[PDB]
């Protein structure tokens, strides 16, 4: 099947690319720069997204049954969503730090203490914002109720009491994990594009603006379907009546594949597309 | 010229409050640690307070802990001691002492002038068993000071300090760390000893070498003095 | 197992490190500019109208420009000190033609120095009022010293000032071409050259150095961010 | 014709000097020391790293008690370190940011520095006021000064880049003796163990042996092919080692008046920045532009170790008086202790 | 969207009860579950009734002991409990799926 | 040109006073440097290193 093959391909690329960037920073001492703190934090966030989200997603999809009991039902979605939001927030911090270094190069803002404080603020804000992903997740038993299913199956889903708390929480979730990093990244890369737009250096600094808009479009496309599908399911209440509930799982598990493909394509579009990183990568 | 001058003494009713302050003219005040060291009307002298350079460390004796406080004013170049809950055991004379600490420095080198204040335990016991030795001008005199704990630290330094108080003025650092002579001392003084037993030797004693000689340990806080040894003719 | 004096010595060392960190915060945000040129260049009248050291400010940015002229003619041994400066300001008296090949040889000796392989040059072609007056006089010709000026026509992509003769513009762009031929023949991408024309009573020089240092640090940031 | 006659006489005297040098050459230092058993691969590891400077470190000097050391950097500071505990004992701000040399007094009381301001500034460490105050500024050189070395508390020998050395008396301020005779910038000097004659290396590939008391150049040593920018005496004061930009060190000899041995390897093409000996006189340590130091056997010309670990060019190097450490400071603002 | 429970109380061992769950605010063609939570223990599944009330589903512990039904007129689901055990004192909730698992206040049964 | 004459004559005087130094053999000088370097081998904490009980940079 195409989905099992796709997950198997995007597992190993994400794993080996991010651990190669990590050990290449760890071995070579000339790569321990202030600009590489966010990139090694992004690489740990992408191996966490790769090992906590992907096998659980494929196993829960192709079996349609949660196995792991209520303690892991409260533990695993916490780590999954914490890893995803850490990855998105460090992408937006990379965009802001590139905005400080190009559109305002003479206010020497990029220091190592700033990168350290930004990293710990990212981890703290994500770990505090994902707390009802550990409070609410209960293991439940879904009865389909149509002639052909005839078999129960355990899910690990949210269980709220009262209808306004999940709506305001998932509106806050959609604003934190998609809309605010997208707005900051669009503002930063749009002003960088206005800045970088004598023949040879213009032809060389136009390519940089092109690949930065490529990076922005990769993030803006790979995270859009799962965000609008999650805010359509939890807030507005769609995909609830069991018309055909194995097409919904197929589209929801395709929309997770785009997230994992972005976490696999991060070390390609952030490290391995510049010649300087290749020249410093083969020295370790 | 280096000088410290303290004021704020006088007669205070018991139980009240009083403030002392030493103004410092002639040295880089912001880089010297400062001490308040007092002396009873007829007894030897004892250490009451210490503030650091940059005020990052403050130490007190057990007698004044909680009812005294010490604070420095680095732009205005002053050191304050605010004393509340005065007993009749705080009648004394107060000296403001500078001391700087780095590798090879000379702490306790310059001493203030002293305010006369009148009011209406796992330590290091420094023992000077003598009280008065009769001297003749042109003779070598040896003064002992026996510690209780060993003052020889593991880094080789033996923290023992010898001071001289002439009749009518403030003490003066003769030797520091059991061997080293301070700047401005005549070379006839010599410090000997080991571990717990120490000796100050004065060769060809003159008439301006009289007074009481104090030994002081700087291995651990609080800094304990000796009882002194008077030298009369 | 430290003593009392050892702990106070460590506290002294910590306060010294605090003052050194404040000095690093001041030192990181300043821009050092090595100013040089020949003896007739008007190099000092640039910095007196805007002495080893000189400090000035443009838009709350601190510039620290230093002219090293207390030594003799052998610059080959102290120029290793200035291999991490922001820019080199090279001043050229562009009106005496017989001392122009010496300036071109000196610029070729600085541009191809092994310690200045990453340092960009802001080039001020000083004293252009005398050049305009000597060209409009017509008594001293440039093809007696540079014969390729007999074959040079001014390009249509130039930016002539209002009031310029074509002869003054041809002379100015020939001199600028003679320097950018040396600057564009080596070190592509590592460092650039920024040629400006300057009068003696010109007042836009601090803004020009400011804009060129902005572009220099922008390119340095594009390089060090794996982003070029 | 008298100019040509004296030029012919000068080249004839240079020919008879070379004849007298080649007459006394009976063997080679690599020929007498064939039978000596070698040293072995030396593994000197980094004990301390001293991280306080903001810009490139240009010079250091050990104290005579083998514990304290002063170091000068291009951000305009001297820092005096307690190297056993890595404590910063002093931090002295300089008037000019471009400092190229550094010196610690053999009594410990004073420190000297100098640079592109042509001035040797002398600082009094043990004042009655607790701060490090500038004692005095010696200003009589017309070029930048390259090296300072104290003789006493009251006199100091200064190399400068106006092709001249000098002997200053600090209680007065006026230079007592001027040692002229070089033709390029004098880059370094090294005093004898008895400090009655010193040696200097300049940018004309020549090293001269000056007598401090009288003032004449005693001998001249011409073996190199580029700028000698490091010099250091053998510990008995009868030989010295020079390092230049032609990737060679060599050991000249005061009594035999000629070169003994060259220390060079074909995989080394960068210049030497610093040269020192060990306490016995067998490990010639040399700092290079390829970011590391080399330990040459001073009797076999063999290499015996590498001290790598500096990210940038090693600019200063020194061995203590008890021989128990080697401090190297480099252009990445770091000093490192090795034994 | 509102779910109200009724019918609980303290009834001795071996009787019968009739819990009612009235539902309003969502379309009436939805599967309705009955869950319970014992004080101290976790949340277990009791019963489930389908969209139109034709197919039921029970767990193993209450199989043949409880019975569920659905009235489409007042939009209510009933759980008639027969043959109570003393280990069944628990709070009963009536849950449904709207994006998540929405439940009601629940009523205490004590035996 | 007289300054060139004075410079050249003081140069030839310097070469004359440098030519008249007594030179010892190079083999005896190498033997002396070797003898000093072998008679001080036990006092070198870099050549023959000391144990960590004596090393102050431990
Ligand atoms: C990642 O984990 C899974 C992925 C898919 C499935 C799956 C697939 C198809 C159908 C079914 C299904 O309903 N049945 C009956 C079989 C289940 C299961 C698991 S899971 O069971 O391991 N974890 C878990 C369970 C319930 C909620 C949460 C919150 C997970 N959060 C998000 O979705 C999410 C929303 C917006 C932006 C990013 C987001 N995001 N992507 C990555 C991590 N967070 C986590």
Automatic annotation (TrEMBL), chain A:
Protein name: Orexin receptor type 2
GO cellular component term, pick one: synapse
Segment of the intact protein contained: 55 to 378 of 444
Residues in coiled coil: none
Protein function: Nonselective, high-affinity receptor for both orexin-A and orexin-B neuropeptides. Triggers an increase in cytoplasmic Ca(2+) levels in response to orexin-A binding.
Main localization, broad class: membrane
Gene Ontology MF: a single term: orexin receptor activity
Record localization: Cell membrane
Transmembrane segments: 1-26, 38-58, 78-96, 117-136, 168-190, 209-228, 248-273
Keywords: Cell membrane, Disulfide bond, G-protein coupled receptor, Glycoprotein, Membrane, Receptor, Transducer, Transmembrane, Transmembrane helix
Domain G-protein coupled receptors family 1 profile span(s) in chain numbering: 17-270
UniProt membrane topology term: Multi-pass membrane protein
Gene Ontology annotations of biological process type: chemical synaptic transmission; circadian sleep/wake cycle process; feeding behavior; regulation of cytosolic calcium ion concentration
Membership in a protein family: Belongs to the G-protein coupled receptor 1 family.
